[PDB]
Amino acid sequence: MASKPIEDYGKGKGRIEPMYIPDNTFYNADDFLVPPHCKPYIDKILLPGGLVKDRVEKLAYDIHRTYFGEELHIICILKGSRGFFNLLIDYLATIQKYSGRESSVPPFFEHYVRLKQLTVLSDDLSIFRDKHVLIVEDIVATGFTLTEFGERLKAVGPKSMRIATLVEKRTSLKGDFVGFSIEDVWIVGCCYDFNEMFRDFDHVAVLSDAARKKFEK
Amino acid sequence: MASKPIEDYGKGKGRIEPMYIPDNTFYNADDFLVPPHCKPYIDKILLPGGLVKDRVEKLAYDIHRTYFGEELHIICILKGSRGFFNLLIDYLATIQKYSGRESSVPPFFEHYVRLKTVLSDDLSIFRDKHVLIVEDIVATGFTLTEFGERLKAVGPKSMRIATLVEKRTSLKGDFVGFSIEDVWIVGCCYDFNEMFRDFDHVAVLSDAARKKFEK
Amino acid sequence: MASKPIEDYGKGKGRIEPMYIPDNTFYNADDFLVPPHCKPYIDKILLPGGLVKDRVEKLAYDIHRTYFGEELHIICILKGSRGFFNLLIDYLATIQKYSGRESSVPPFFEHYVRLKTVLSDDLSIFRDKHVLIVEDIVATGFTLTEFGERLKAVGPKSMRIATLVEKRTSLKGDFVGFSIEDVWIVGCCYDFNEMFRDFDHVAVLSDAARKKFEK
Amino acid sequence: MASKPIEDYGKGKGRIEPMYIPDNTFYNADDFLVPPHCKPYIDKILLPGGLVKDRVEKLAYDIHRTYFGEELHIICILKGSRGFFNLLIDYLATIQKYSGRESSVPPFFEHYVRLKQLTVLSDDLSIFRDKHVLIVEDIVATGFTLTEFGERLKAVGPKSMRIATLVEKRTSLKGDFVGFSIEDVWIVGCCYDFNEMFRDFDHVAVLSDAARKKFEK
Numbered sequence A, D: 001m002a003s004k005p006i007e008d009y010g011k012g013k014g015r016i017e018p019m020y021i022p023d024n025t026f027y028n029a030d031d032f033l034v035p036p037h038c039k040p041y042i043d044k045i046l047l048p049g050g051l052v053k054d055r056v057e058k059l060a061y062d063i064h065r066t067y068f069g070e071e072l073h074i075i076c077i078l079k080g081s082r083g084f085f086n087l088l089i090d091y092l093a094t095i096q097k098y099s100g101r102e103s104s105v106p107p108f109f110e111h112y113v114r115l116k117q118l119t120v121l122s123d124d125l126s127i128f129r130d131k132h133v134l135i136v137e138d139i140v141a142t143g144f145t146l147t148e149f150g151e152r153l154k155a156v157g158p159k160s161m162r163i164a165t166l167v168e169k170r171t172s173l174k175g176d177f178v179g180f181s182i183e184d185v186w187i188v189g190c191c192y193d194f195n196e197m198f199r200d201f202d203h204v205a206v207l208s209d210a211a212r213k214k215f216e217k
Numbered sequence B, C: 001m002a003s004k005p006i007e008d009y010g011k012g013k014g015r016i017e018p019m020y021i022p023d024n025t026f027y028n029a030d031d032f033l034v035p036p037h038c039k040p041y042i043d044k045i046l047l048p049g050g051l052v053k054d055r056v057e058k059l060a061y062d063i064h065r066t067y068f069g070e071e072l073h074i075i076c077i078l079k080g081s082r083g084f085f086n087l088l089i090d091y092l093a094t095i096q097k098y099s100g101r102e103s104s105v106p107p108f109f110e111h112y113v114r115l116k117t118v119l120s121d122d123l124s125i126f127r128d129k130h131v132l133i134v135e136d137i138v139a140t141g142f143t144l145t146e147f148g149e150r151l152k153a154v155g156p157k158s159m160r161i162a163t164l165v166e167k168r169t170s171l172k173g174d175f176v177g178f179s180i181e182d183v184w185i186v187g188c189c190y191d192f193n194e195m196f197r198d199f200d201h202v203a204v205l206s207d208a209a210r211k212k213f214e215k
């Protein structure tokens, strides 16, 4: 069932809980291949990139089970969600291609919105009126960003509104498809940045004091 | 060398010529796994998805040779270039990562602009930067000519274009994957009125497809 | 249906015809990223690596349709079929995993035999089993005719062949990727005296290559 | 330097230590997409498949640094090492293809040996005389298997002999390139089996009592 009353947006009603990552649990950067521009600044790896992919596969499957045979409009929140969104749509298409169930509806219709008080850079949001919408976000912390953007999308009157977020911090709005629950720390790598740096690093790391001082501004 | 005169933008001066795909050269869709939503509409495949990936690896290496050791700002033109851009940035990061060369600069810095008019963040941050515009296809050359003039006003250090496909139908790219005949393509992020982006291969738009998804 | 009479082995009875690659149809090596050790020797690419992967996905789906819900024993013929086998088993596991169908049987059980004569574990365990022999290429058909007779003696339940390539030069496979002209291929696990297996694309053996790596 | 005196075989002399996985550290199977034939039997995931790939990348790089421009003969121990070996050779070729250093020597020359008192099913081992050999193994526990096979290969007189093993158990011979150090438990998945079952599962799991009883024989 793709239906979900608008009023439920951000409640995480009937969700599958995310993978819980306890406090002070990290891998050492030295065990991974870290590139020279990252070497001085990465010490602790919270989520290896291949752990992120394995988790995204399970989210995708959850998503496909929810919307199969229903038109689905998926919104990528740029820039941060690029990595997670591109993995997710790759899985969604593949799952639908291999599924024994056959549908005449594509697996998803993609959209982009850039968020940076919330700023909204995007096409006219009216195209989402009466559509099933899935917001793909990289990380929710206080919930402010998705609460404001959600309020603005509700105004157009979508048919349904759900949230897929790769990480939620333990500090509030909650996503419907969430990969990981982590302790309240600043993360970089795997598309997470610190003043635009580290996005190209393959793993989700903790921001180091060395990084923070070198790239603060 | 990353340096290149701004006046050379769109001239494809000194480029490596793309892979030339001759007219009326196609693979049969029946030889590929085609999902149900595309099955009635896809007959001819111009570029198998795997061939796209092999060519994008060669372009990433060409781009790595050009910009290695220099700050590189890459602009994705949405929505069409999403797939090419995502493949390209993955190969650039990997190539640098395995190169055995030491650089203190990341392999790229990413940016996004949506064209259809323009929609983007403030463009003045490209001043005195090395910029690579990544696009899905160049046909008349109008889109990149127009966006190019807009960017030239902020005074970048250099401007190049990477385009997966150029049609033989005139602006040209610097890193181009394939030269094809003048036909409307769909699949691998190419669409016909927002349809077929998710198909894994580059195909020609058939009659059946044109009819059902018409204006 | 997994069932198939043992007497039909090698006849390609009821198969889906492979992708036909016409004579003198090649891509230029200069359009691909070719590593230094292959660079002097590779000129023409018959099958880009990505095209191989796209076709292997279609074969895995064909094999999934045939054996789903039945115990399937897959034999890799070493060393040549390593690459095809590894791609095939990855796609079969994934296809089953995402199929949304419930089966209590794994997508395959793997086995290995080395031919050049035979080298393998005891073959009697294939008695009353559904067997799929995975091979890199069939040319005269001698290798699979001979190994086939050996296996037939243990009384399998059914026997089929998956071959990535068949040359038009006669035994034929049941799941075949490509029909090519009669030429010696190298790359993508195809070798010339143990050379070129690691190259990512299927290429023709050139003169330069023949000379340097000769008998 | 590819050189290594034969006498050092199995000592792990001058190795990079593996990634240490503490006792009683597992992920829950429920957080992953587990296929129906595995669902009843997998409970605890020790090493997510994408964690294995990220670690294999770092081993490959270590291996490339050791043998670049030197002829390298790599032996896959079947059936168990298939997964690890195929990931490793894919990385090795790619690293050499992207390397700024150029060599006229291929990244590796592959070989297969099936081990099951040790049984050795293989081509004539004499082809390894005076060659640099790397044995690729899935898991070392007591060290018996690699000690016996190593003794048999020494007899032919290779130039050098090193061991790459994805996992070593904490119970003895040691590998030169080792991915993980784990507690002494029986593992399945990601090519590890229990009486031929579970190899196709994507993650390295702990054998469950339910699995053991269902597949014992």
Ligand SMILES: O=c1[nH]c(=O)c2[nH+]cn([C@@H]3O[C@H](COP(=O)(O)O)[C@@H](O)[C@H]3O)c2[nH]1
Binding pocket: A080, A138, A139, A140, A141, A142, A143, A144, A145, A146, A185, A186, A187, A188, A191, A192, A193, A194
């Ligand atoms: O790179 C990042 N590492 C983090 O640890 C982190 N926490 C929050 N964010 C981003 O900052 C904002 C926080 O989201 P909230 O509005 O819910 O507080 C949004 O823009 C979030 O995407 C992060 N970005």
Ligand SMILES: O=c1[nH]c(=O)c2[nH+]cn([C@@H]3O[C@H](COP(=O)(O)O)[C@@H](O)[C@H]3O)c2[nH]1
Binding pocket: B080, B136, B137, B138, B139, B140, B141, B142, B143, B144, B183, B184, B185, B186, B189, B190, B191, B192
């Ligand atoms: O999906 C598509 N299939 C095509 O065959 C095709 N040809 C051009 N285009 C898009 O339309 C414009 C063509 O660009 P020009 O300004 O160079 O003519 C740009 O916006 C191009 O992306 C295509 N899009």
Ligand SMILES: O=c1[nH]c(=O)c2[nH+]cn([C@@H]3O[C@H](COP(=O)(O)O)[C@@H](O)[C@H]3O)c2[nH]1
Binding pocket: C080, C136, C137, C138, C139, C140, C141, C142, C143, C144, C183, C184, C185, C186, C189, C190, C191, C192
């Ligand atoms: O690398 C290769 N490139 C080729 O073009 C080629 N043609 C045949 N073969 C191998 O030689 C034998 C051919 O099999 P037949 O028994 O069917 O003739 C089998 O052992 C095949 O694997 C090739 N190997």
Ligand SMILES: O=c1[nH]c(=O)c2[nH+]cn([C@@H]3O[C@H](COP(=O)(O)O)[C@@H](O)[C@H]3O)c2[nH]1
Binding pocket: D080, D138, D139, D140, D141, D142, D143, D144, D145, D146, D185, D186, D187, D188, D191, D192, D193, D194
């Ligand atoms: O599937 C497996 N899960 C395990 O936990 C495990 N421990 C050892 N092995 C295999 O059994 C033998 C043990 O190696 P040792 O000779 O060093 O004891 C060799 O055949 C090893 O590869 C395992 N296989």
Ligand SMILES: [Mg+2]
Binding pocket: A077, A078, A079, A080, A081, A115
């Ligand atoms: Mg953001």
Ligand SMILES: [Mg+2]
Binding pocket: A080, A192, A193
């Ligand atoms: Mg940010």
Ligand SMILES: [Mg+2]
Binding pocket: B077, B078, B079, B080, B081, B115, B136
């Ligand atoms: Mg466009």
Ligand SMILES: [Mg+2]
Binding pocket: B080, B190, B191, B192
């Ligand atoms: Mg378009």
Ligand SMILES: [Mg+2]
Binding pocket: C077, C078, C079, C080, C081, C115, C136
């Ligand atoms: Mg062979």
Ligand SMILES: [Mg+2]
Binding pocket: C080, C190, C191, C192
């Ligand atoms: Mg051969």
Ligand SMILES: [Mg+2]
Binding pocket: D077, D078, D079, D080, D081, D115
């Ligand atoms: Mg073994």
Ligand SMILES: [Mg+2]
Binding pocket: D080, D192, D193
């Ligand atoms: Mg075993």
